[PDB]
Amino acid sequence: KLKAGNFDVAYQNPDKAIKGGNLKVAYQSDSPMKAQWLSGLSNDATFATMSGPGGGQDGLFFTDSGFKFIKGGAADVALDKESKTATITLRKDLKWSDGSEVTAKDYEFTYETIANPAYGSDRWTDSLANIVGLSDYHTGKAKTISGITFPDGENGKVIKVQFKEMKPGMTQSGNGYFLETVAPYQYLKDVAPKDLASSPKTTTKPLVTGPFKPENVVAGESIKYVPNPYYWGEKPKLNSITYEVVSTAKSVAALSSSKYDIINGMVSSQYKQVKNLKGYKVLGQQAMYISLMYYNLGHYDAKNSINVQDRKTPLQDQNVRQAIGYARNVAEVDNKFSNGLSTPANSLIPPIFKQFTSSSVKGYEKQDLDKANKLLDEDGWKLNKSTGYREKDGKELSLVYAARVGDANAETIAQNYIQQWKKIGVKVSLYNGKLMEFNSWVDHMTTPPGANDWDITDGSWSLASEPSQQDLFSAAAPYNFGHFNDSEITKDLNDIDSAKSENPTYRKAAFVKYQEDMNKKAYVIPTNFMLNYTPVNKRVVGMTLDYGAMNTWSEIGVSSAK
Amino acid sequence: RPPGFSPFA
Ligand SMILES: [Cl-]
Numbered sequence: 242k243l244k245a246g247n248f249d250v251a252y253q254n255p256d257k258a259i260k261g262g263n264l265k266v267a268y269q270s271d272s273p274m275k276a277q278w279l280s281g282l283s284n285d286a287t288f289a290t291m292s293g294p295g296g297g298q299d300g301l302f303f304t305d306s307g308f309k310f311i312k313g314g315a316a317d318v319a320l321d322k323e324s325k326t327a328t329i330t331l332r333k334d335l336k337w338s339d340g341s342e343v344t345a346k347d348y349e350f351t352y353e354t355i356a357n358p359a360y361g362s363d364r365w366t367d368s369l370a371n372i373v374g375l376s377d378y379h380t381g382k383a384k385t386i387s388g389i390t391f392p393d394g395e396n397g398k399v400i401k402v403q404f405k406e407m408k409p410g411m412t413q414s415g416n417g418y419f420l421e422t423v424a425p426y427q428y429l430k431d432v433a434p435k436d437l438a439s440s441p442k443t444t445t446k447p448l449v450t451g452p453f454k455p456e457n458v459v460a461g462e463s464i465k466y467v468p469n470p471y472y473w474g475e476k477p478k479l480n481s482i483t484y485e486v487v488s489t490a491k492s493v494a495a496l497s498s499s500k501y502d503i504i505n506g507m508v509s510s511q512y513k514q515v516k517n518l519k520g521y522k523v524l525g526q527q528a529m530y531i532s533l534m535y536y537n538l539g540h541y542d543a544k545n546s547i548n549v550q551d552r553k554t555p556l557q558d559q560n561v562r563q564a565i566g567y568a569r570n571v572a573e574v575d576n577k578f579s580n581g582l583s584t585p586a587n588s589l590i591p592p593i594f595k596q597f598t599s600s601s602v603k604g605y606e607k608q609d610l611d612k613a614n615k616l617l618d619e620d621g622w623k624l625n626k627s628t629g630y631r632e633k634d635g636k637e638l639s640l641v642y643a644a645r646v647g648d649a650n651a652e653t654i655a656q657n658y659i660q661q662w663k664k665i666g667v668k669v670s671l672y673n674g675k676l677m678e679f680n681s682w683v684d685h686m687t688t689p690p691g692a693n694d695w696d697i698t699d700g701s702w703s704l705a706s707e708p709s710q711q712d713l714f715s716a717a718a719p720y721n722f723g724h725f726n727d728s729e730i731t732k733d734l735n736d737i738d739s740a741k742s743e744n745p746t747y748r749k750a751a752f753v754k755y756q757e758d759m760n761k762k763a764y765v766i767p768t769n770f771m772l773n774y775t776p777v778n779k780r781v782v783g784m785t786l787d788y789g790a791m792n793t794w795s796e797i798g799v800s801s802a803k
Numbered sequence: 804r805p806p807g808f809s810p811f812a
Contacts (some may be wrong), residue, residue, distance in 0.1 A: 270810055286807030300804065364805070415804045508812040532811065647811040683808050703807040712806050720806065771812070 244581040244772060245513040245593075250523025251785035254731035256271040258798025261480030267487040267501040269508065271646055272679040274486045278447040280422040281354035281362045282438045284683055286703035290505055291484045294466045294794045296451025299422050301329070301348075302775035306789030308414045308706040314791065315450060315473065316348075318419075320333040320411055325511070327402040327411070327419050336471035337425050346395040347423040352386060354424055358543070359434035363687045365546055367715035368417040379546065384789060390441045408738045409748060415706030416737075422451065452477045452795045462486065478798035479785075489648055496521060499803070502778035508648040509582035512774055521776045522623060526786050527771040531586060532701040534569070534766040536562060540690035546717045550726040554708075560620035562763035565697070566605040568661045572766055578650045586767035588756035594708040596745075597752040602785035604760045604767055613665045624666045631666040641697035643672035645682055669697070686722040699768070702716060706788075708752070709738055725764040734756055 270287050276285035278299040292298045296315075303314030310318050316331045335343040352779040355362040356369065356379045370376045374387030383698075388403035402419050410416035425448045432440050444450075445458040452474065453466035466482035487495055487504060492513050495501050507515065516523055538557065539550040555561050571585040590597050622631035622638055631638045641661075645653035655676065664671045672695055677685075685692055699720070705712055711734055714721050733755040742748035759765065777784050782798045 269812065272810070280805065284808055286809045288804075289807050297804075417805065421804055438804075506810070506812050530809065645811055651811070679810050699811070701809045701811045705806045705808045706804050 242581055243575075243584050246525075246527050246772065248521070248772070248774065250526055250787055252522045252777050252779075252781065253522055254782045254784075254800065256346065256780075256782060256800035258478050258800060259796075261478060262799060262802060263481045263483070264479050264503075264781070264797070264799060266484045266503045267495065267505070268484070268487040268491060268602070269492055269504060269506050271488050272486075274463070275680065276415045276444045276458055276460060276464075277438065278449065279351075279354055279424050279437070279443050280420075281351060281364055281424070282360065282443070282686060284363055284534065285679075287486070287506075288705070290733075291464060294451060294453035294482050295455060295464075296403060298423070299450045301331070301421050301423060302414060303791050304706075304789065305412050306602070306787060308788060309412055310414060316341075320407075322407055325404040325407050327404070329400045329402070329419075330454045331398040331423075332473050333398060334473050336473065337428070337448040337450060338469050338471060339448055340471055341427060341448075342396075343423055343450060344395060344426075345391045345393065345397045346426050347362060347401045348393075348400050348420075349386070349389050350396075350424045351420050351422050351431075352389060354437070354649065355420070356386065357434060359389050361435065362438055362714075362717045366533050366712045366718040366720070368369070368408075368711045370632075370717060371405050371408070371418055373405060391650060399647040406740065407743075410707040410709050410738065413707045416647050416709065417705060417707070417712045440769070445723075450686045451469055451480055458483075475792055477793040477795045482794075485803070493518075498774055499778065502799070503784070504776055504780050507774065507776070509579040510648045512582060513667065515776050518776065520779055522779060523774050523776055524784075524786050525772060525774040527591070528773050529591065529593050529704050529706065529773040530702060531589065531591050531704060532699060532768045532771070533586070533589070534566065534724045534768055535698045535700050537692070537696050537698070537723055538764060540693075540721055540728070541721075541724055543689040543719075548716050548721050548724045548726050549717075550724060551694070552724070554696065555622075555633070555636075556621055556640070559761075559763060560616040561622070561638075562766075564613040564616040564665060565662060566604075566666060566763055566766040567609045567616070568665045568667070569605065569658050569766070569768075570608045572606065572608065573614065574654050574657055575769065578654065580647075582772045583769045584772075586770050586796070589759055589765070589767055590708060590756060591704065591770050592754060596788065597708050599753050599756070601754065602756045602760070604756075606767075608661075610661075610664055617665060617667075622666070629666065637668060638666065639668040639670075641672055641694065642669045643682070643685075643695040643698040644676050645699055645701075646678055647675045673721060687719055689719065700765075711732065711738065721766060727762060727764070729758060730755075730762060 301316035352709040454469040463485040575583045585606040688772035
């Protein structure tokens with residue numbers, strides 16, 4: 242039995258909030274905090290969530306519960322279909338945490354932090370290539386970005402972004418075709434590009450635009466938020482916010498002792514205990530998330546920003562990729578460890594984007610050992626009676642599985658799949674004989690070209706707030722860390738964001754073909770959709786998980802002290 | 804807003 246999305250979205254406290262005082266928040270991370278206040282240089286969702294009170298790495302635009310752009314935030318955006326342009330207008334009194342003005346150059350500088358390879362960003366994508374002159378700037382063929390212009394100059398509050406083709410998702414946040422953050426140029430201009438990621442000016446002592454500012458950052462541990470006097474909007478209620486990382490093992494004990502008022506991104510296996518904790522209300526909603534299984538299919542060319550599917554591996558055969566997916570027992574694993582929060586995935590598009598999901602799409606949600614064996618049989622891999630593993634040309638079907646650290650069931654689940662691949666005759670061993678730590682895993686997947694010492698890994702995503710998956714799978718993007726390149730898949734991705742897909746009936750059919758083709762080609766295998774839950778202490782006022790709530794950090798407060 | 808690597812939850 243799986244739990245329905247009938248969790249309470251908001252905790253409506255009858256108690257009035259005080260002045261201030263001190264809120265204590267934590268994020269469940271077994272890895273140390275990675276402090277990076279520039280959106281272009283940060284790859285993890287862990288710190289992106291922790292940077293919330295500071296502006297969410299300096300987010301600009303406001304949003305309704307459907308992630309669509311609305312007016313009234315730090316900046317406003319307007320589209321023009323026939324000219325193929327976006328116009329971004331910053332607020333006249335938009336300021337950094339040091340009092341200095343946020344200008345048009347600050348927004349453009351964000352594009353440079355990703356496009357200019359000297360900063361070492363992993364966020365380059367085919368989506369960004371749609372901006373006129375950005376590809377030429379990215380390759381170094383130009384000195385500036387021609388598609389980005391300033392109607393009122395670099396000091397002004399207006400920026401114009403020129404596109405080659407208009408995209409449907411442009412009315413929605415997380416589209417990726419244009420950026421939504423600003424970076425402090427004046428403060429960071431004297432720092433060499435290759436030094437910017439490790440500079441104290443982007444890590445421990447930065448400048449922000451949000452309601453709170455980091456008074457102190459304890460590297461790899463915590464943030465000390467205090468109210469920002471130069472914030473354009475409402476004055477926050479609280480005196481301070483402390484945002485800390487908390488290990489999986491210590492999370493439940495931290496709740497019992499009231500050390501934290503809120504813990505975000507808790508694993509499904511702990512919900513059993515969290516629900517029994519009085520003094521806390523457990524909120525919840527459909528996670529904008531997917532976990533899936535990756536195959537290592539090639540390498541990434543960094544100089545030319547292109548994924549090359551050229552790795553010499555038995556995983557280049559389609560029948561081998563499908564069988565390994567069909568061998569897994571995701572459903573059995575879910576029913577045993579996830580407390581009804583994880584539903585086995587049928588495709589790549591999560592239930593949260595309900596409009597573009599289809600029950601017609603059959604995937605790998607149901608285990609089929611017989612079909613797995615057959616697919617391997619009719620492909621040329623014959624089982625060896627002696628060893629118990631399939632062989633071809635005398636080469637044994639031996640693969641490396643880079644499994645990852647997680648909850649207390651992480652090591653169990655990893656071995657669970659290994660035994661299933663054992664049943665079909667595929668020899669699978671763990672990477673270096675032990676589970677991989679999150680921080681070093683990300684570096685191993687994102688850094689070019691790169692790694693050839695793994696075959697199977699598990700990817701977990703805090704997905705973009707827009708259904709399109711160009712920033713995950715497009716040929717130019719490093720985030721495609723399996724490094725596949727398929728003409729049909731590219732066409733499917735492009736057709737999803739084509740001019741015809743402005744028509745939602747057409748875009749619906751483009752998503753359905755994409756999901757069916759991704760399942761068939763089996764470059765990646767959809768594992769889980771998740772339902773997220775959040776324990777909130779009963780003293781907290783104005784707390785909500787609603788995606789439409791914009792002034793959340795300013796309106797949030799407490800009813801009592803410790 | 805943008806895609807991000809998550810720990811596994
Ligand atoms: Cl160009």
